[PDB]
Amino acid sequence: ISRKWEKKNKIVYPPQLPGEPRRPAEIYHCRRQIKYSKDKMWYLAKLIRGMSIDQALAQLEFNDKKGAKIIKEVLLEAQDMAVRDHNVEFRSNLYIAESTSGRGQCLKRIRGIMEKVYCHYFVKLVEGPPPPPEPPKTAVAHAKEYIQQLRSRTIVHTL
Amino acid sequence: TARGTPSRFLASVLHNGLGRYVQQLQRLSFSVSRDGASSRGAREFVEREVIDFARRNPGVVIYVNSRPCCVPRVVAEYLNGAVREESIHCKSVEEISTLVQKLADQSGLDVIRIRKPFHTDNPSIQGQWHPFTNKPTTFRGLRPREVQ
Amino acid sequence: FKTEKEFMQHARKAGLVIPPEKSDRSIHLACTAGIFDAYVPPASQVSIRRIKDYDANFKIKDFPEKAKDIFIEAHLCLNNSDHDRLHTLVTEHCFPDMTWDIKYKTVRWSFVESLEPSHVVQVRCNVYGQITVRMHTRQTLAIYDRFGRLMYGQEDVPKDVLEYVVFEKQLPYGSWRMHTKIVPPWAPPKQPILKTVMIPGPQLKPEEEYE
Amino acid sequence: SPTELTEMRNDLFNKEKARQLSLTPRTEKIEVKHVGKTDPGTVFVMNKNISTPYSCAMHLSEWYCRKSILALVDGQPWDMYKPLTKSCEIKFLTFKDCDPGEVNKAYWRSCAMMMGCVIERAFKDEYMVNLVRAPEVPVISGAFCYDVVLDSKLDEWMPTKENLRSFTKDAHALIYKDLPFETLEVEAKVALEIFQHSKYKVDFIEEKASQNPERIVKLHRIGDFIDVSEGPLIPRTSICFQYEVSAVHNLQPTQPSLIRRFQGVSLPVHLRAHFTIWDKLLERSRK
Amino acid sequence: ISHGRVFRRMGLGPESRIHLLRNLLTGLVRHERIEAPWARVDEMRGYAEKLIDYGKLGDTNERAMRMADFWLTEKDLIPKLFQVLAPRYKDQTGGYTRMLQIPNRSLDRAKMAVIEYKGNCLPPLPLPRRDSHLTLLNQLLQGLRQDLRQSQ
Amino acid sequence: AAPKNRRTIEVNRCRRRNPQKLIKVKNNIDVCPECGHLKQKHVLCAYCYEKVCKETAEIRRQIGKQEGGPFKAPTIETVVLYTGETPSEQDQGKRIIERDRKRPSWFT
Amino acid sequence: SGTWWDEHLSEENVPFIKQLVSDEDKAQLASKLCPLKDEPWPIHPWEPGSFRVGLIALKLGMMPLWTKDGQKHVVTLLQVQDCHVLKYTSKENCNGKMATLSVGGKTVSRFRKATSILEFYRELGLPPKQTVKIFNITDNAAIKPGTPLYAAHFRPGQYVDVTAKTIGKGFQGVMKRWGFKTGDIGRVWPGTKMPGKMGNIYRTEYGLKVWRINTKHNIIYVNGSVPGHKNCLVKVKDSKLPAYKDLGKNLPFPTYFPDGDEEELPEDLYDENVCQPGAPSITFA
RNA sequence: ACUGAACUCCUCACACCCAAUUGGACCAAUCUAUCACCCUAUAGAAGAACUAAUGUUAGUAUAAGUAACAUGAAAACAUUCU
Ligand SMILES: [Mg+2]
Ligand SMILES: [Mg+2]
Ligand SMILES: [Mg+2]
Ligand SMILES: [Mg+2]
Ligand SMILES: [Mg+2]
Ligand SMILES: [Mg+2]
Ligand SMILES: [Mg+2]
Ligand SMILES: [Mg+2]
Ligand SMILES: [Mg+2]
Ligand SMILES: [Mg+2]
Ligand SMILES: [Mg+2]
Ligand SMILES: [Zn+2]
């Protein structure tokens, strides 16, 4: 057992200066010992990894898997503590920065050993609009990269 | 091995031989136990050799700290802000003298792999080879199968 | 659960018989559940005798000076979060009420000169002395966050504060500590907040309606 | 100078926003009850002359930001980025409402103004372009219009297909920029200060400041382009999905100068039409 | 290869699929609205409308009374099929049922459906409405219809 | 047969993280206009359907009270009535299921 | 979100758009009925060694057809439904050995095509066809793009090759698919016969006699069996079989033109050996 | 003629490429004696060193989220039907 992710909401930053950009909020939440496997949660956790919380909620209400409901409870809970506890003004203005799933303390049942599998779920929400997705690189980017690799090369193994 | 280790090119610190030569070793910091069997050769080094050494190069400032250590060290600091900490643990005076002169003689650059054994900054004098050295020109700059 | 009745009814339905056991040690309280006589703001030399018969070296003419230093110093213990001094300066009815909500955020309270002299108002009374004081001051606040961004009050600008601070003393080793702070019902609203709030309506299950 | 026009107009605009926010009583906080069909009876406790209906939508969800377009503030149509003024009541109006009249009108006014933003910066510099107005065309009538007076050089000019196509390409360049529509309710003196170099828009400001009991006049800014509207507008340029400048017509009773009207048709990202339906809506938008 | 195979194979045989469908049809004649899984519902929808077409053949018809006797496992519903449902639909010739999808079943995540019989006393379903005729696109197309009517 | 070697996490990660095994972001999802809870297109709103389900549940309970015992399907059409509503002239010759709440906004 | 054409239309506007778009499809099919009163391309006579256009036809089904020798011939019907020439590409732009005509059949909804296709058919002036097949063709046969091809492009007696997707049987094993059931070779050769997806592939039946064409309903009555299910689209070209490479003398060479109005055709052309219905019952005397 | 080695030369350094076997020089950590006192020294001792015994125990992989397993139906959850 380690429990470092719960403590991450207790970092206190020194107050800022007027000539300094506003730091976005960061809300670390998790659930432990979910009775589900860590590699079935990987798909649900992977699904929502840059989405706004409204898009994440909306995608998990219509998913048929067992873990979707659990993650939806974790995200509604973290939206609550986002606003109440951590000074986020808009409920809507969050996005999922981190969503992973580790393994939990499993049990062993003798039938012939069979593991009762548990998992956790870790989410960091960050205040702000979700960052724009990475554009696919164009033929201009490929051509510049190639030519820059040609400009880069040296006479090798000499002076 | 070379693919595990970092590498660098052969360099100086501030063109160290061009104008004048500057000793790259600023500080030595000896720390020597008073009662302690490992810093015996350090003790006999402070008593015999460190004053002669300190006079043979005055650009180096030497600090002998003499606390109760369990392993004695020397800490060489260089002009480019590198720090080499070496132990003089259970060494004779002669071995410490060769180590301290070794630290004096070298510079602060890393003793990682050096790629080439040389470093010109002006490698070419007659002009570096491009594919139109050693080619004749044509009349009116024509190329093959050019009509006019 | 939400109360003791819910837990004892759940322990009766479950079968958890908790025997009330007799212990010779009890809890040695040094405070009071609230205020003896609620001083409602716009003859009690009885209780001054009932204080001087225990303390016997006590000048009220010097006390609102002392009540200033018990006040101000306590508030400076919020600037550093020094709880160990606050237990000397403030009561245990008053310690959570001033330090709980302020946790995980930095406050930068400061005092500047009083508009009026602080003056004692009333005094009441195993024995708990209790003295209410009127203070009319100028203070500064800046409550920041976990992330160090301002959520209450301009840092420089002083504001005029009325403070009906109630002190309390145990009557062996105790002293005068802030017990509470009466806020009158006529008092003006405080500073507004830098952020905006949505307040939800009733969350309706499908079987009910909004009216 | 045209660059001096846009610079001096935007500077007068920012003088009016700078005076507009300076007259705050330091974050007064007014509350607005969400009088609406769904998610009912939620008050928003908001900053007075700062927070807009868009921020109320942001308190609710991403859904009410993306789908809502006007706001019935006390039964009055309001922009999403117009700052609120007092304790009020908000509905949020979308395109797919039961009776979305004011949203069709707002969309229509918006597309005419975006068109004017394309027209002014379309011609090469030696040609005087002069935007008289955007008349209130019904949405059933086929196409949003914009009346423009052109230079005497282009008295006999009629654009080709490629010139209307170049107008649309500038319009999709104007959509892609994703520009909000700033608003300012300004009294008529500063309104006449900004447009002090166009007889037509001066007379328009005068006719509209004569309609309210104050001298109050709505100004809107897309990006570096100011115009006078009759009412509210769309929140952003990014809402217009399909957009075509379809035709140019010349009005007939034109003795002083040509009141040369432009035609266009457009649909939002919400009410996209299929390609064939869109072609028939192009055809009908050329009358 | 199942080209042109029109029947779902269900239950644990052909006989058992006809008894499953018969239980669903009995449920829907009794209650006039059913949640059941989707494939079972549209199979049974085919049977339900045919059953009313036998209900319109008259009470006195012998063949209709044989079909109703088979298909309705509760015998009190056979007066209902010949005096409530068949008189209700005596006007229209088809389309006696409506089917929609529910969200998926909580238990095993099955595609769910409702069929009801049209025009029943029960509270109405939240039917999927077309978009309003007063929207932007619908007003443009209304205007275009007005112009193509102006051609004559 | 049995596996000749043990597959590595590099091969495995390439197997169980390629897009054929990832969950597809679906975009059928709208907001129900009546309730504001987000529904899916082509599917009824879960919330509004739960409303209608609960009211058919009370109505069917009172059907069961007025019938009494099994095998009592009436040969008559039925009409649901709420508090303070006269049966209409159209509602004559129909059994009546009186309710105790108000007529809903959506029942008609 | 993605949309479809019907999504935002009211109840009032859905049959309006059906009648509108359907009526423009009928008008566009009706405008192309006069290719020669238009400005066609120069019509050349048949030269020995030239190729002409094919068709695209529905497979209607089969029926028997008795010849004068009293032998059955099972015959597929192939209706030509809205066949038209779509684009001509010369051999220079093709970089193939021969010029090509693109021809498409069976008008299909405009609400269900990619916009590049709808721009293509919009410029061409036609409602979009379901399939477009490409014909290798000489320069002499090149009808202008946008012209109707009819059933009487073929005539009875002509032999014909038909290509269509075969009826897909899905994943089948070895006994159905291939019809059966080394050590030192440590591997399975390419092209080994194994289970897999049977059918749903293009196959061509070569050299099929055309027995009878029906000019009114535009049916071709072809000998034997054609690949594909009923109501499938087939590509009907003249046969490449070298026993049938020279009989393009009597065939109308660019294509058959009813617009030419010269010696118009009956209801149904029959081959000489076909027992027509309505003929007296045949006797072998 | 040129290329071509760990051969030979060249600049500096040299105790620094065999099985089993056998000779030697050092030595990790531990405990004891006495030092030492941010981790050591001189000795004395010993359960004194593991990439390998289908080793022993425990953990966790892989095969694998695979094989396999499970709840007749509608409903008022009363009940009825198959
Ligand atoms: Mg089965
Ligand atoms: Mg091999
Ligand atoms: Mg050698
Ligand atoms: Mg050692
Ligand atoms: Mg051992
Ligand atoms: Mg080991
Ligand atoms: Mg083994
Ligand atoms: Mg081992
Ligand atoms: Mg396997
Ligand atoms: Mg299986
Ligand atoms: Mg079972
Ligand atoms: Zn709903």
PDB file of C-alpha atoms in Angstrom, chain C residues 6-124:
ATOM      1  CA  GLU C   6     -29.145   6.865  13.862  1.00  0.00           C
ATOM      2  CA  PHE C   7     -26.078   5.004  15.130  1.00  0.00           C
ATOM      3  CA  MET C   8     -27.783   3.590  18.226  1.00  0.00           C
ATOM      4  CA  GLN C   9     -30.878   2.527  16.271  1.00  0.00           C
ATOM      5  CA  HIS C  10     -28.590   0.945  13.669  1.00  0.00           C
ATOM      6  CA  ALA C  11     -26.669  -0.737  16.508  1.00  0.00           C
ATOM      7  CA  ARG C  12     -29.934  -2.028  17.951  1.00  0.00           C
ATOM      8  CA  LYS C  13     -31.136  -3.345  14.574  1.00  0.00           C
ATOM      9  CA  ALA C  14     -27.707  -4.895  13.946  1.00  0.00           C
ATOM     10  CA  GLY C  15     -27.244  -6.312  17.456  1.00  0.00           C
ATOM     11  CA  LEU C  16     -24.218  -4.221  18.457  1.00  0.00           C
ATOM     12  CA  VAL C  17     -24.752  -3.939  22.201  1.00  0.00           C
ATOM     13  CA  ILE C  18     -22.380  -1.226  23.390  1.00  0.00           C
ATOM     14  CA  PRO C  19     -22.258  -1.353  27.217  1.00  0.00           C
ATOM     15  CA  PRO C  20     -21.886   2.124  28.794  1.00  0.00           C
ATOM     16  CA  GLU C  21     -18.776   1.503  30.886  1.00  0.00           C
ATOM     17  CA  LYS C  22     -17.800   3.421  34.013  1.00  0.00           C
ATOM     18  CA  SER C  23     -14.429   5.161  33.859  1.00  0.00           C
ATOM     19  CA  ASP C  24     -13.022   7.306  36.660  1.00  0.00           C
ATOM     20  CA  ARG C  25     -11.407   9.768  34.235  1.00  0.00           C
ATOM     21  CA  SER C  26     -13.599  12.246  32.397  1.00  0.00           C
ATOM     22  CA  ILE C  27     -12.784  14.969  29.902  1.00  0.00           C
ATOM     23  CA  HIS C  28     -11.170  18.047  31.430  1.00  0.00           C
ATOM     24  CA  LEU C  29     -12.809  20.808  29.409  1.00  0.00           C
ATOM     25  CA  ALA C  30     -11.412  24.344  29.475  1.00  0.00           C
ATOM     26  CA  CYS C  31     -14.189  26.019  27.468  1.00  0.00           C
ATOM     27  CA  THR C  32     -17.904  26.661  27.171  1.00  0.00           C
ATOM     28  CA  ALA C  33     -20.544  25.684  24.617  1.00  0.00           C
ATOM     29  CA  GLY C  34     -21.101  29.254  23.472  1.00  0.00           C
ATOM     30  CA  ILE C  35     -21.815  32.401  25.450  1.00  0.00           C
ATOM     31  CA  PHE C  36     -23.223  32.832  28.961  1.00  0.00           C
ATOM     32  CA  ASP C  37     -25.316  35.910  28.269  1.00  0.00           C
ATOM     33  CA  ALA C  38     -25.663  36.794  24.595  1.00  0.00           C
ATOM     34  CA  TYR C  39     -24.645  40.437  24.549  1.00  0.00           C
ATOM     35  CA  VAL C  40     -27.092  42.126  22.198  1.00  0.00           C
ATOM     36  CA  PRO C  41     -25.493  45.438  21.126  1.00  0.00           C
ATOM     37  CA  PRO C  42     -27.236  48.685  20.057  1.00  0.00           C
ATOM     38  CA  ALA C  43     -24.683  46.449  36.748  1.00  0.00           C
ATOM     39  CA  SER C  44     -22.378  43.444  36.280  1.00  0.00           C
ATOM     40  CA  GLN C  45     -19.893  44.350  39.040  1.00  0.00           C
ATOM     41  CA  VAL C  46     -21.357  41.190  40.617  1.00  0.00           C
ATOM     42  CA  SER C  47     -19.296  39.113  38.195  1.00  0.00           C
ATOM     43  CA  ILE C  48     -16.292  41.416  38.694  1.00  0.00           C
ATOM     44  CA  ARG C  49     -16.355  40.492  42.379  1.00  0.00           C
ATOM     45  CA  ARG C  50     -16.846  36.865  41.313  1.00  0.00           C
ATOM     46  CA  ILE C  51     -13.674  37.260  39.225  1.00  0.00           C
ATOM     47  CA  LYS C  52     -11.522  39.186  41.715  1.00  0.00           C
ATOM     48  CA  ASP C  53     -12.243  36.675  44.484  1.00  0.00           C
ATOM     49  CA  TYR C  54     -10.371  34.084  42.396  1.00  0.00           C
ATOM     50  CA  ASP C  55      -7.765  36.204  40.619  1.00  0.00           C
ATOM     51  CA  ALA C  56      -7.270  39.051  43.145  1.00  0.00           C
ATOM     52  CA  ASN C  57      -4.940  41.078  40.908  1.00  0.00           C
ATOM     53  CA  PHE C  58      -7.086  42.290  38.065  1.00  0.00           C
ATOM     54  CA  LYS C  59      -7.585  45.790  36.690  1.00  0.00           C
ATOM     55  CA  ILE C  60     -10.319  46.235  34.099  1.00  0.00           C
ATOM     56  CA  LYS C  61      -8.803  49.639  33.291  1.00  0.00           C
ATOM     57  CA  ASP C  62      -5.846  47.700  31.839  1.00  0.00           C
ATOM     58  CA  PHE C  63      -7.809  44.813  30.303  1.00  0.00           C
ATOM     59  CA  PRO C  64      -8.924  46.105  26.818  1.00  0.00           C
ATOM     60  CA  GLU C  65      -5.277  46.968  26.296  1.00  0.00           C
ATOM     61  CA  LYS C  66      -4.534  43.294  27.031  1.00  0.00           C
ATOM     62  CA  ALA C  67      -7.569  42.263  24.955  1.00  0.00           C
ATOM     63  CA  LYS C  68      -5.986  44.116  22.042  1.00  0.00           C
ATOM     64  CA  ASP C  69      -2.780  42.081  22.310  1.00  0.00           C
ATOM     65  CA  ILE C  70      -4.649  38.817  22.743  1.00  0.00           C
ATOM     66  CA  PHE C  71      -6.622  39.706  19.624  1.00  0.00           C
ATOM     67  CA  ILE C  72      -3.965  40.979  17.252  1.00  0.00           C
ATOM     68  CA  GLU C  73      -1.214  38.506  18.124  1.00  0.00           C
ATOM     69  CA  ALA C  74      -3.675  35.639  17.631  1.00  0.00           C
ATOM     70  CA  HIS C  75      -4.505  36.883  14.153  1.00  0.00           C
ATOM     71  CA  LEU C  76      -0.807  37.090  13.309  1.00  0.00           C
ATOM     72  CA  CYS C  77      -0.608  33.405  14.172  1.00  0.00           C
ATOM     73  CA  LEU C  78      -2.793  32.883  11.111  1.00  0.00           C
ATOM     74  CA  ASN C  79      -0.175  34.524   8.883  1.00  0.00           C
ATOM     75  CA  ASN C  80       2.353  31.803   9.736  1.00  0.00           C
ATOM     76  CA  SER C  81      -0.065  29.024  10.782  1.00  0.00           C
ATOM     77  CA  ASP C  82       1.452  28.717  14.265  1.00  0.00           C
ATOM     78  CA  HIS C  83      -1.159  26.624  16.012  1.00  0.00           C
ATOM     79  CA  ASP C  84       0.900  26.024  19.142  1.00  0.00           C
ATOM     80  CA  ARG C  85       0.727  29.700  20.066  1.00  0.00           C
ATOM     81  CA  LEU C  86      -2.959  29.872  19.167  1.00  0.00           C
ATOM     82  CA  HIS C  87      -3.713  27.336  21.852  1.00  0.00           C
ATOM     83  CA  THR C  88      -2.279  29.815  24.338  1.00  0.00           C
ATOM     84  CA  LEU C  89      -4.097  32.752  22.747  1.00  0.00           C
ATOM     85  CA  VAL C  90      -7.509  31.370  21.832  1.00  0.00           C
ATOM     86  CA  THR C  91     -10.037  29.020  23.360  1.00  0.00           C
ATOM     87  CA  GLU C  92     -10.872  25.589  21.996  1.00  0.00           C
ATOM     88  CA  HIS C  93     -14.386  26.671  21.067  1.00  0.00           C
ATOM     89  CA  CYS C  94     -12.710  29.363  18.972  1.00  0.00           C
ATOM     90  CA  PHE C  95      -9.693  27.495  17.552  1.00  0.00           C
ATOM     91  CA  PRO C  96     -11.495  25.355  14.895  1.00  0.00           C
ATOM     92  CA  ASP C  97     -13.924  28.154  13.996  1.00  0.00           C
ATOM     93  CA  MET C  98     -10.981  30.317  12.941  1.00  0.00           C
ATOM     94  CA  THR C  99      -8.490  27.724  11.663  1.00  0.00           C
ATOM     95  CA  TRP C 100     -10.532  25.028   9.938  1.00  0.00           C
ATOM     96  CA  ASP C 101     -11.713  26.774   6.784  1.00  0.00           C
ATOM     97  CA  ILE C 102      -8.362  28.581   6.445  1.00  0.00           C
ATOM     98  CA  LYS C 103      -6.482  25.291   6.031  1.00  0.00           C
ATOM     99  CA  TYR C 104      -4.691  24.725   2.703  1.00  0.00           C
ATOM    100  CA  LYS C 105      -4.722  28.421   1.827  1.00  0.00           C
ATOM    101  CA  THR C 106      -2.529  31.337   2.829  1.00  0.00           C
ATOM    102  CA  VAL C 107      -3.972  34.319   4.654  1.00  0.00           C
ATOM    103  CA  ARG C 108      -2.217  37.694   5.003  1.00  0.00           C
ATOM    104  CA  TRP C 109      -4.172  39.540   7.676  1.00  0.00           C
ATOM    105  CA  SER C 110      -2.571  42.644   9.114  1.00  0.00           C
ATOM    106  CA  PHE C 111      -3.489  45.252  11.688  1.00  0.00           C
ATOM    107  CA  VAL C 112      -3.218  49.003  11.362  1.00  0.00           C
ATOM    108  CA  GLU C 113      -4.131  51.685  13.911  1.00  0.00           C
ATOM    109  CA  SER C 114      -7.505  51.599  15.660  1.00  0.00           C
ATOM    110  CA  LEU C 115     -10.088  54.276  14.960  1.00  0.00           C
ATOM    111  CA  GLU C 116     -11.428  54.149  18.530  1.00  0.00           C
ATOM    112  CA  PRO C 117      -9.912  52.946  21.823  1.00  0.00           C
ATOM    113  CA  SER C 118     -10.977  49.364  22.515  1.00  0.00           C
ATOM    114  CA  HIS C 119     -13.330  49.260  25.472  1.00  0.00           C
ATOM    115  CA  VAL C 120     -14.860  46.541  27.612  1.00  0.00           C
ATOM    116  CA  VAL C 121     -18.616  46.116  27.444  1.00  0.00           C
ATOM    117  CA  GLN C 122     -19.807  43.453  29.863  1.00  0.00           C
ATOM    118  CA  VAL C 123     -18.512  40.769  32.209  1.00  0.00           C
ATOM    119  CA  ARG C 124     -20.186  37.517  33.286  1.00  0.00           C
TER     120      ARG C 124
END
